[PDB]
């Protein structure tokens, strides 16, 4: 029942007052259950009937579907959670099974009516006040308010995590080898004792809790291999995710989308790529949990996509600190990369895929890097240590990339994996000019007002050219110009621009891009044999530059 | 131990709120140490455990002063400093010791522990909350809020300025020619004596401080006497191949932004035509006129460049080859206060993040010693990379403010 544990002081947001929203009448059969559900709740002191002095209220509803054969009382705290002070969500994420080590005996406890056990600050109670409507409208409102932590209120999770840490603090200090883990209302207890001596230890825990109000029901995972903890299955030697099943429906309400959004975020921790962005925007656009909302195209596409993701079966082996951590990375879809972290070959701990925007333009190696950087941080958050790295790329390749690249970068310890899609550099832009090669003194321009402007060179050989361009930026024509000088040119060239913009996009030796033109400029650059891009200041009497402008420039 | 003291009331700047940063993840080696350092610090009653109901947070982590020593907890109070009330006039220090930079030697002492006796205004305390990561988020974090002046803060030395002045008055009497400066948890001590005969005057200040109740560790040295400048230089293949007169006139075109006494003309002319870069053009007797005059204005100190205590300091770093780096510290663009080239890396120190880190620091201490303030950095690295390594090479007790960028062809315009 109600824990006689020390309650936390909770404040509202600075300046905001409590929630005073209006209750909307349900049905005479719904309403009667809501009262009966509330007379059972007032019987257990979870709640307390109030009066004509309390100026606050919160919307009460009744969900039609009975989960575990229970048609309960859903409350809408949406307003209160806005007025309810912030809290602090202590951790850096959810735990992950590959963190765990093999513990002989294991036991997972379920905290029954957990939130309902721990109590709420007697002051903040006037705020959680609600009201069950009346059947005979000749009779008034059945006003309540909570005494315990509500089920959807903002703080409840935060607080209860605290209430439980303090109650398990004693018990944790007395048997420093038995590991106890905590998340929502699932208690993981596991150690290296044998069944008897260990179950005594569980009994002792169950009792320690009971003395404090928390009640672990008989639904105890008494040592039988499939332990269900946090949407996973802890087997004797491996773990497997319990399959996530999203609801299929055509008529979604404010509430129903909400639950799913949650389930999605939950699922998003275990699996990647799962978005919630569009579905989310449906909740900002309308009120009242009952009223229906039609999905959009983006939102309905999302659902089919996550559900797609949520299809691939996930699993792994437990952690062994005696051994090294190895993480192997591979290339895939011209921007797709896969990695697997393991200790014993073929025995996977974590398996995933990294794919991300290396900027507007990108490089291949400069992609592997970020892949590495992201694996390290994930490892450090799971095993507190950096994994030894196996990278598909010759040693002197990386060497020749950081010796050149103006930006400082680094990859921790890594060994060479001789495997197919090897990452490497496609084209070495020369350092000094080539003797003999044709000297293309390029330029280009446009008009912001018309979107039309010129683009072409003026070689040393006397050659010339130009082209008229429609719907181009004063800049893209400058990139274009380099395109030309490259095509109409031998296996060796000495281009020369006035564009800082392009000088850079080229300098960074890109491999792919979002810009078609650039993409084209790449392919050519590879094709060629001895390129040389140089730079010289515009609007000055330099060289051929001085003359190529006139042809490309507007009114002179 | 805490002296019965009436707490000095501190407030956040107007309109602002306390920090709510987030905690970067830490290794096992590091977490452990923060845990030991915290249980004791907690028995000694310095910091107290706190609940969820405290919105705030700051990052904490564990560095390591020198080679194979004891872990020193470090707190990233950068965010709290910015929001914390600049103080009346009792500054972090005093009207900056103009000669701190000209001393034959300078030693740095971690005075930090000093703050551990004074109590901190009961109200301002929630704003110092910090949280300790737990490997694999097994345990809900260790949450702690200070009770005493915190070592990182700026309110600390601001407050304990009186006390420290007192503690030092004697050492100042006896030794008048010795210059001492305090930048937060640090005492900058510089004299014009021999090193062996410097390292004594220090230990003396050590023992004395030790007597008046300050437990200082051993010491760190610098000699702002050999500190030099790195200038803009012109090549040897002057006015030769076309290419050459191009890079030349390119470079000399930028430096106009600095000193406008330079001229392009008698060089852009040799550039006239549409000639192959590969051509050894004629170094005409009118170009040598422009270049020898261009050579000159370079070996010269800028005009109008003078420090202003009101604007922030900024620094830019350009990687430049084999264990070589360069940097610039200014307040207003192109108006240089200092240009230099940190270069000391090969083999074992051949790690990009390690080198940059160390450079950042040499630039930061150089600003304290010289202007008595930390510069805002413009870092030649991508945010994510640098953030997964700095702390593995950071040894200082302060953390400067940094921003991340992309170096254009500036690298060529400095080496």
Helix (H) or strand (E) holding B326, with range, is strand B325-330
Give the Cα separation of B103 and B16 in Å (integer). 41
CB contact under 8 A, B52 and A8: yes
Q: Do A90 and B131 touch (CB under 8 A)?
A: yes
Cα within 13 Å of Cα(A480), Cβ side:
22
| Domain covering B99-115+157-221: architecture | 2-Layer Sandwich (3.30)
Residue-wise over A317-330: b if at least 16 C-beta within 10 A, else e?
A: bbbeeeeebbbbbb
For residue A81, CA distances in Å to A16, A86, A201, A405 come to 11, 9, 39, 49
Annotated binding site of B for Mg(2+): 110, 185-186
What strands, in cross-sheet order, belong to the sheet with A179-183?
A: A105-110, A186-191, A179-183
A384 in contact with chain B, both atoms CB, cutoff 8 A: yes
H or E segment and range at residue A304: helix A297-309
CB A421 within 8 A of CB A392: yes
**What technique determined this structure?**
X-ray
Q: What b/e string do you get for A95-116 counting C-beta neighbours within 10 Å, with b at 16 or more?
A: bbbbbbeebebbbbbbbeebbb
Using an 8 Å Cβ cutoff, are B31 and B134 in contact? yes
Using alpha carbons, list the distances in angstroms from residue A385 to A324, A325, A382, A388, A554.
10, 8, 8, 10, 61
The answer to whether A384 touches A378, Cβ cutoff 8 Å, is no
Provide the 10 A C-beta neighbour count for residue A431: 7
In Å, how far is A360's CA from the nearest CA of chain B? 14
Superfamily of domain B1-90+116-156: HIV Type 1 Reverse Transcriptase, subunit A, domain 1 (3.10.10.10)
Instruction: Give A-chain residues touching B269 at CB under 8 angstroms.
Output: 541
Q: Are the C-beta atoms of A278 and A285 separated by less than 8 Å?
A: no
User: What residues contact residue A248 under an 8 Å CB cut-off, 6+ apart?
Assistant: none
Do the chains contact at B384 and A543, CB–CB below 8 Å?
no
Distance, CA of B50 to CA of B47 (rounded, Å)? 9
Residue A292 and residue A281: Cα distance in Å, rounded? Answer: 14
A357 touches chain B (CB under 8 A): no
C-alpha B292/C-alpha B131 separation (Å) is: 62
Strand A512-513 with A238-241, pairing = unpaired
E-assigned strand segments in A303-416: 315-317, 326-331, 337-342, 348-354, 361-362, 388-391, 414-416
Give, in degrees to the nearest 5, the angle at Cα A256 between A254 and A298: 75
- In B349-368, the residues whose Cβ lies within 8 Å of chain A are 351-353, 355-356
Are B40 and B144 in contact, with CB atoms under 8 Å apart? no
Phi and psi, residue B102, nearest 5°: -95, 0
Q: Is A77 helix (H, G, I), strand (E, B) or coil?
A: coil
Three-state DSSP state, A415 = strand
Give the H or E element holding residue A365.
helix A365-382
d(CA A289, CA A261): 14
Please give the distance of CA B82 from its chain centroid, rounded to a whole number: 16
Same fold, B1-90+116-156 and B222-307: no
Say whether A409 and B385 touch across the interface (CB within 8 A).
Answer: yes
> Roughly how many angstroms between the first and final C-alpha of chain A, as a whole number?
88
| Lookup result for tokens 């809900």 | B140
User: Could you tell me if A254 and A78 are in contact, meaning their C-beta atoms sit under 8 angstroms apart?
Assistant: no
Torsion, Cα A66 A72 A74 A75, to 10 degrees, reads: -170
**Residues forming beta bridges with residue B186, ordered by sequence position:** B110
Structure tokens at A26: 């349900």
User: Are the C-beta atoms of B141 and B132 separated by less than 8 Å?
Assistant: yes
Using an 8 Å CB-CB cutoff, list chain B residues near A434.
278
Query: What burial class does residue A273 get, using C-beta atoms within 10 Å of its C-beta: 0-12 exposed, 13-18 middle, 19+ buried?
Result: exposed
Resolution of the solved structure (Å): 2.8
The domain ranges of chain B are: 1-90+116-156, 99-115+157-221, 222-307, 308-414
Nearest Cα residue to A185 out of A162, A161, A205, A168: A161
Which residue in the set A158, A406, A541 is minimally distant from B407, CB to CB?
Answer: A406
Virtual torsion, Cα A151, A155, A160, A165, nearest 10 deg: 160
Cα distance between residue B33 and residue B62, in whole Å: 7
Known binding residues of B: 110, 185-186
Torsion of CA A28, A29, A32, A36, to 10 degrees: -170
Three-state DSSP state, B137: helix
Q: Do B138 and A181 touch (CB under 8 A)?
A: yes
Greatest CA separation for chain A: 103
- Indicate the residue of A90, A380, A409 with minimum beta-carbon distance to B25: A380
Q: Which of residues 116-135 of B touch A (CB under 8 A)?
A: 129, 131, 133-135
Q: Structure tokens of B403?
A: 């921003």
Contact A16, A84 (CB under 8 A): no
Which ranges of B303-370 would DSSP assign to H, the alpha helix? 352-370
On whether the CB atoms of residues B328 and B257 are closer than 8 A, the answer is no
What is d(CA B230, CA B340) in angstroms, rounded to the nearest whole number? 5
Comparing alpha-carbon positions, the chain B residue that sits nearest to A166 is B51
Residue window 162-181, chain A: list those with CB within 8 Å of chain B: 162, 165, 179, 181
The answer to whether A178 touches A189, Cβ cutoff 8 Å, is yes
Cα–Cα distance for residue pair A373/B381, rounded to 1 Å: 13
Annotate B98-128 with b (16+ C-beta within 10 A) or e (fewer).
eebbebebbbbbbbbebbbbbbbeeebbebb
Distance CA A9, CA B126 (A): 14
Superfamily of domain B222-307: Reverse transcriptase/Diguanylate cyclase domain (3.30.70.270)
User: Pick from B20, B385, B411: which is nearest to A406 by CB?
Assistant: B411
Q: Is B241 on the interface with A (CB under 8 A)?
A: yes
Q: What is the token pair recorded at A202?
A: 């569980």
- List the end-to-end C-alpha distance of chain B, in Å, as a whole number: 53
Considering only residues 455 to 514 of chain A, which have any Cβ-Cβ distance to chain B shorter than 8 Å?
458-460, 494, 496, 500, 503-504, 507
- List, in order, residues 6 or more apart from A399 with CB less than 8 Å away: none
Supply the DSSP symbol for B213. Answer: T
Helices H / strands E in chain B, number of each: 10, 14
- Strand runs (DSSP E) across A402-552, as ranges? 414-416, 453-454, 468-469, 496-497, 512-513, 534-535
CA distance B337 to B313: 9
- With beta carbons under 8 A apart, name residues in chain B contacting A436: 278
Residue A191 CA to residue A227 CA, distance in Å, equals 15
Other CB atoms within a 10 A radius of the CB of residue B14 amount to: 6
**Angle at which helices A516-527 and A476-487 cross, to 10°:** 30
Query: Measured between CB atoms, which of A86, A504, A541 is closest to B55?
Result: A86
The span from the CA of B193 to the CA of B107, in Å, is 12
Roughly what angle, to the nearest 10 degrees, separates helices A156-174 and A195-210?
130
- What structural domains does chain A harbor? 1-90+116-156 (3.10.10.10), 91-115+157-225 (3.30.70.270), 226-319 (3.30.70.270), 320-426 (3.30.70.270), 427-556 (3.30.420.10)
**Do the Cβ atoms of B140 and A162 come within 8 Å?**
yes
Helix (H) or strand (E) holding A167: helix A156-174
Q: Which residues pair with A443 in a beta bridge?
A: none
Please answer whether residues B49 and B41 qualify as being in contact, where contact means their C-beta atoms are separated by less than 8 angstroms.
Answer: no
Q: Tell the CATH superfamily of the B308-414 domain.
A: Reverse transcriptase/Diguanylate cyclase domain (3.30.70.270)
Residues of A in contact with B345 (CB under 8 A): none
């Amino acid at each position: 029942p109600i824990s006689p544990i020390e309650t936390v002081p909770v404040k509202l947001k600075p300046g905001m007052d409590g929630p005073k929203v209006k209750q909307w009448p349900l049905t005479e059969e719904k309403i009667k259950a809501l009262v009966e559900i509330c007379t059972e709740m007032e019987k257990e002191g979870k709640i307390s009937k109030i009066g004509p002095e309390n100026p606050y209220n919160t919307p009460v509803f009744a969900i039609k579907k009975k989960d575990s054969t229970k048609w309960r009382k859903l409350v809408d705290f949406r307003e209160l959670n806005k007025r309810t002070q912030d809290f602090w969500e202590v951790q850096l994420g959810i735990p992950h099974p590959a963190g765990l080590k093999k513990k002989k005996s294991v036991t997972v406890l379920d905290v029954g009516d957990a939130y309902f056990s721990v109590p709420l600050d007697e002051d903040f109670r006037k705020y959680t006040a609600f009201t069950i409507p009346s059947i005979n409208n000749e009779t008034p409102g059945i006003r309540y308010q909570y005494n315990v932590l509500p089920q959807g209120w903002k703080g409840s999770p935060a607080i209860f995590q605290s209430s439980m840490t303090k109650i398990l603090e004693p018990f944790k200090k007395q048997n420093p080898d038995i590991v106890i883990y905590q998340y929502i209302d699932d208690l993981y207890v596991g150690s290296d004792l044998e069944i008897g001596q260990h179950r005594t230890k569980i009994e002792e825990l169950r009792q320690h809790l009971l003395r404090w109000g928390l009640t672990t029901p008989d639904k105890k995972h008494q040592k039988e291999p499939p332990f269900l903890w946090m949407g996973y299955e802890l087997h004797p030697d491996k773990w497997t995710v319990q399959p996530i099943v999203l609801p299929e429906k055509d008529s979604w309400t404010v509430n129903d989308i909400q639950k799913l959004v949650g389930k999605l975020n939950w699922a998003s921790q275990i699996y990647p790529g799962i978005k919630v962005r569009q579905l989310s925007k449906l909740l900002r656009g309308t009120k009242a949990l009952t009223e229906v909302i039609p999905l959009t195209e983006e939102a309905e596409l999302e659902l089919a996509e996550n559900r797609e993701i949520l299809k691939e079966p996930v699993h792994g082996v437990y952690y062994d600190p005696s051994k090294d951590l190895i993480a192997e990375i591979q290339k895939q879809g011209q921007g797709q990369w896969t990695y697997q972290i393991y200790q014993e070959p073929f025995k996977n701990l974590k398996t995933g895929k990294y794919a991300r925007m290396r900027g507007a333009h990108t490089n291949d190696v400069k992609q592997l890097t970020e892949a590495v950087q992201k694996i390290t941080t994930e490892s450090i958050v799971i095993w507190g240590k950096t994994p030894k790295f196996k990278l598909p790329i010759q040693k002197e390749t990386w060497e020749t990339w950081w010796t050149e690249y103006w930006q400082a970068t680094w990859i921790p310890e890594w060994e060479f994996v001789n495997t197919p899609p090897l990452v490497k550099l496609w084209y070495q832009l020369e350092k000094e000019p080539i003797v003999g090669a044709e000297t293309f003194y390029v330029d280009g321009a446009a008009n912001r007002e018309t979107k039309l402007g010129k683009a072409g060179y003026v070689t040393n050989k006397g050659r010339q050219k130009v082209v008229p361009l429609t719907n181009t930026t004063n800049q893209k024509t400058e990139l274009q110009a380099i395109y030309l000088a490259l095509q109409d040119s031998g296996l060796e060239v000495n281009i020369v621009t006035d564009s800082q913009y392009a000088l850079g996009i080229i300098q960074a030796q890109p491999d792919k891009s979002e810009s078609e033109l650039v993409n084209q400029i790449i392919e050519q650059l590879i094709k060629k044999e001895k390129v040389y891009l140089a730079w010289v200041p515009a609007h000055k009497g330099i060289g051929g530059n001085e003359q190529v402008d006139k042809l490309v420039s507007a009114g002179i | 131990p805490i002296s019965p003291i009436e707490t000095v009331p501190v407030k956040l700047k107007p309109g602002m709120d306390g920090p709510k940063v987030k905690q970067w993840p830490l290794t096992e080696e590091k977490i452990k140490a923060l845990v030991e350092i915290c249980t004791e610090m907690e028995k000694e009653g310095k910091i107290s455990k706190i609940g969820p109901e405290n919105p705030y947070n700051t990052p904490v982590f564990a560095i390591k002063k020198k080679d194979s020593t004891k872990w020193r907890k470090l707190v990233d109070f950068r965010e709290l400093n910015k929001r914390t009330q600049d103080f009346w006039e009792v500054q972090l220090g005093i009207p900056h010791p103009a000669g701190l930079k000209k001393k034959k030697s300078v030693t740095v002492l971690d005075v930090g522990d000093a703050y551990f006796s004074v109590p901190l205004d009961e109200d301002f305390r929630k704003y110092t909350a910090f949280t300790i990561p737990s490997i694999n988020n097994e345990t809900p974090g260790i949450r702690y809020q200070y009770n005493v002046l915190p070592q990182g803060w700026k309110g600390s030395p601001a407050i304990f300025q009186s006390s420290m002045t007192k503690i030092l008055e004697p050492f100042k009497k006896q030794n008048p020619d010795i210059v001492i400066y305090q930048y937060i948890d640090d005492l900058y001590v510089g004299s014009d004596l021999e090193i062996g005969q410097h390292r004594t005057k220090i230990e003396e200040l050590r023992q004395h401080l030790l007597r008046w109740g300050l437990t200082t560790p051993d010491g760190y040295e610098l000699h702002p006497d050999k500190w030099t400048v790195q200038p803009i230089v012109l090549p040897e293949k002057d006015s030769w191949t076309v290419n050459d007169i191009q890079k030349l006139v390119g470079k000399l075109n930028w430096a106009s932004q600095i000193y406008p006494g330079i001229k392009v003309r008698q060089l852009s002319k040799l550039l006239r035509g549409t000639k192959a870069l590969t051509e050894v053009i004629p170094l005409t007797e009118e170009a040598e006129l422009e270049l020898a005059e261009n050579r000159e204005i370079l070996k010269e100190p800028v005009h109008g460049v003078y420090y202003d205590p009101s604007k922030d300091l900024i620094a830019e770093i350009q990687k430049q080859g084999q264990g070589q780096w360069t940097y610039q510290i200014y307040q207003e663009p192109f108006k240089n206060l200092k240009t230099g080239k940190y270069a000391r890396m090969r083999g074992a120190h051949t790690n990009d993040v390690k080198q940059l880190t160390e450079a950042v620091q040499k630039i930061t201490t150089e600003s304290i010693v010289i202007w008595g303030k930390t510069p805002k950095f413009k870092l030649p690295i991508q945010k994510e990379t640098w953030e997964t390594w700095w702390t593995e090479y950071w040894q200082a007790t302060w953390i400067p403010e940094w921003e991340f960028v992309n170096t254009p062809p500036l690298v060529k315009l400095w080496y």
